[model samples]
Target chain A: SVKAHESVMDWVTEELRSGRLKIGDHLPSERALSETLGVSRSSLREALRVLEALGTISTATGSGPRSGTIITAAPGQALSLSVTLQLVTNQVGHHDIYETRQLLEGWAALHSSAERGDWDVAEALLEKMDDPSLPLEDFLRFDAEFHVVISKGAENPLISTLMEALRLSVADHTVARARALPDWRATSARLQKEHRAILAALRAGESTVAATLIKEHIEGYYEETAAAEA
Target chain B: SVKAHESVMDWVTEELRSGRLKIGDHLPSERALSETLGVSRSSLREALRVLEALGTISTATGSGPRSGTIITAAPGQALSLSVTLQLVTNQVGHHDIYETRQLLEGWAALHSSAERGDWDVAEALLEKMDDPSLPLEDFLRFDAEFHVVISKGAENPLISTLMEALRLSVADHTVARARALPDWRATSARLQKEHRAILAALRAGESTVAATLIKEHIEGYYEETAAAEAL
Candidate 1:
C-alpha cells in the first residue's frame, strides 16, 4: 500500500518520466498540488521536503512566483554526504576506494590523453607539483587538481562530480597516509616521477599506456602506504 | 554566511566524520537538538528532512525508545533518484553509462570470480536468462539480477548500490533500444551465449578472462544497437 507521502513521490516521478515535469520547472501551490494529487497538504509538504534534501527539488516560501517547489538536480552534495556516512560506518573500505580510483583515473587518463588542451592544463598543474619547497598541503592540492583536470577532460559532468566527491572524501586520509610514510621525500619523489610519466604518455598520444600508467601510479602509492602502516 | 539549516548539516557531518555518530544511534529530540545547535525548530526540521531524504537518518514521532531520529545508512534510494533525474535531464549519456558499466562490471567480475559461492550465485541467475521462451521483460530482469549478483559478490555495498543505480536509470532506454533493433532474436541469442561464456570464465577462476567477456558483452550489445538505429 502506498503511504500518502509516498504517493506524492510517485506522482512526481511519473511526471518526470513522462516529460511533463522538468528541471527548473515550478510546481503548483501547496494547496493546489495537494488537491490535485489527492493527498493532504501535510503529506505533500513531507514529500517535497525529502525531494529537496535529495537535491532533486528546492522550495521557498512567500506568495511570489519563486515560492513553491522547483525541480533541480544537484547530486554531488548528496552523493558526498552519503559516501562519507558509509565510509564512517565501515560499509566501504580503503581498498575499495583505491580500486575505484584506479578505474576512474584510468578512464580519465585515456580520455584526457586524447585532448591536447586537457593535456596542456594537466602539464601546467604538474609543474606546480615539481616545486621542491612546496609544502605537503600545496603538493596534495596540486595533485588533486591534476586528477580533476583529467576527469573534466572526459566532458561528463556526472563522472567528474563523482570523481571529485570520491577524491575529497579520501583527501584527509591520503594526507595522513602520506605523513605516516617512513620516507616522505622518497615517496613524494616516486610519485612525481610517475606523474611525469603519466603526462608523458598523454603527450605521446598513447591513451592505453596513459591509462595503464595512472592505474599503476594510484595502486602503487596506496599499496605502499598500506605496507608502511603494517 | 551560512544559513541556519546549513549549520545543522555541518554539525551532523562533523559528528559523522569523527565517528561520533554511527548507524542505529538515535539523535537527540528535535527540541533539544535545536536548542543545542542554536537553530530555530523550523530550520532544524528542514535540515532533518534533507538528511532523511539522503537516507542518512530516519525520524519518527510519539513517545518510546525508538521515537526520535535514528541514524541510518541506506544510500541506494538516494543514488537511484539522483541518477534517474540526471538521465531524464540528459546530463548523462548512454556512452557514459556504458563506460561506467564496463569499469564497474569488469571489477566486479574479477572479484566475484575469486569466490566460488559468488560464482555459483551468478551462474544460477544466468541459467534463468537461458529460458528459450522467456519474455523480454523476464530476460531483462534476470540480466540485471546477474550483474547485481556479481556486484554483491564483490561484497561492497557502495559499489553494488552505485552499479544498481547506473543499471536502473538506463533500464527504459536499454529496453527501447532493444525493441528498435532489427533482429531481436539474433541479438537475444548472442547475449545469452555471451552470458554463458562469462559464467564459464568465472567458474574457471579466470578473473581477467571473465572481465574481458563482460566488457565485450556490454559494449557489444550497445554498439550493435547503435548501428541498427543508425541504419
Candidate 2:
C-alpha cells in the first residue's frame, strides 16, 4: 500500500506529467494543498521535499510574494546525489561509470561534430591542458572543463546534466588514480594526444570518427586507471 | 538558504552518500530521528516522504515486524517521473529522446553481442513480434520487452532503468503516432525487418554492426512516427 506521502508525490508528479503544472507556477500553500489533496500537512510537506530534492520545485519561507513552492526544472542535484549514493554503496563501479561515460561522451562528440558549429571553448580547454607547467590538479580541472564544454555543444540539457553528474561522481577517484600513476608525465602526454585527436575529429566534422575516438580515449584512460588502482 | 525540511533531506542523503545507510537498514522512528536531527517531527516526516518518493526508502505504519522506514533502492519511479515531467515540460523532445535511446540501445547491443551469451529471451520476444495475428498493442509490448531484455543483457541496472523510463515516457505518444499512420501493415513489416536484422547482428556476434543497426532502427522509426504526427 502507498503511504500518505507517497500518494501525494504521485498526485503532484501526475499533475506535472500532464502539463497541468507549468514551470514558475506557484503551488498552493501547505494548508491549501493538504486540504485539496485530502492529505495532512505533514504528508504534503514530504511530497514537496522530494520534489525539491529532485530539482523540480523551489520554496521560500515566511509570508511574502515568494513564500510558496514554485515549479522548477533542475534535475542535476538529484542526479548527482543518486550517482554518489550508487557509487558509495558499491552498486556501480569504475567500469560501469566509464562505460556510461563513453556512451555519453561519444554521443556528445557525434552531435557536436554533426552540428559543425563553433567549438572554441572545447578547443581552448584542450590548449590549456597542454601547459606543461600546469599542476596535475589544474590540468584535471581543465580536462573536466573540456568534456563539459563538449557535452554542452550537443545542445541537450538532459544529456549534459547526466554527463556532468557522471563526471563529478568519479572526480575523487580520478584524482587518486592520476596521483597513483608511476609515470604522470607520460600518461598526461598520451591523454593530451587523444584529446587533440578528439578535437580534430570534431573540427573535421567526422562525427562517427569523433564518437569512436572519444569512446576509445575514455576507455583507454579508465583501463589504465583501473590497472593502476590494482 | 535551505528550509528546515530541505536541510533534513540533505542530512539523510549525506548519510546515504557516506554509506552510513545501507539497503534494508531501518531508519529511526519519526520522534527519535526528529529529536536526533534537532528538528520537528513534521520536518523529519517531510524528508522521509521525499526519500520514499525517490524509491530510496519505504515506510510501514504501526508497530510490529517490518514496521519502520526501510532503506530501499528502487529508483526507477523517481527517474521515470523525472523523464515524464521533463518530456511534458518540453525540456526534451522526441528527437532528444530518440538520440539518447540510440546511445543507450547502441551500447546495449554492442555489450550484449560482445558477451556472446544466450539471447534466448530476446530471440523469443522477436519471434513473438513476428506473429501477424498479434494486435498493435501486444506488438508494442513485445517491442518494449525486446529492448528491455537487451538493456538488461548489457548488465547495467542504471542504464537499463533509464532506457525503460525513456521508453515509457513516450508510450502514449508512440501509440498515438502509430495509430495516426495510414499504412499499418507496411510499417509493421518494415519494423519486423529491422528487428530481425538487429537480432541477426547480435546472434552473429557483430557488436559494431549491432550497435549501428540498433541506432538506425530507433532513429528510423521515430523519424517516420514524427512525420506522421506532423501530418
Top candidate when judged by TM-score against the true structure: 1
Over the stretch A1-230, how does candidate 1's per-residue lDDT look in tens digits? 12655676566667776889887778777888889888778877777766676666776566386557787755535555565566655666667666667767777767763554377787888888878888877787678777777766567665665676555555644675676689877888999999888878777777788888888888888889888882
Q: Which stretches of candidate 1 lie over 4 Å from their true place?
A: A1-38, A58-64, A68-70, A77-91, A113-146, A156-158, A176-213, A216-230, B1-74, B116-139, B155-158, B181-197, B227-231
List model 2 lDDT by residue over B1-231, tens digit each.
Answer: 235446655666677768788766787777777777787776666666666655556665446336877766444344445555566667766566666777788777777733643568778887888888888877876787677666765656557645654454545335646876777688888988998887777777787787888888888778787777744
Candidate 1 clashing pairs, residues 3+ apart or interchain:
none
- For all candidates in order, state the fraction of native interface contacts they contain: 0.45, 0.28
Cα error, residue A155 of model 1, in Å, equals: 3.4
The DockQ score of candidate 2 comes to 0.27
- Candidate 2 versus truth, CA RMSD in Å, comes to 6.2
How well does chain B match by TM-score in each candidate?
Answer: 0.64, 0.63
Q: In candidate 1, how many Å is residue A49 off?
A: 2.0
Show the lowest summed lDDT stretch of 10 residues, model 2 chain A: A75-84
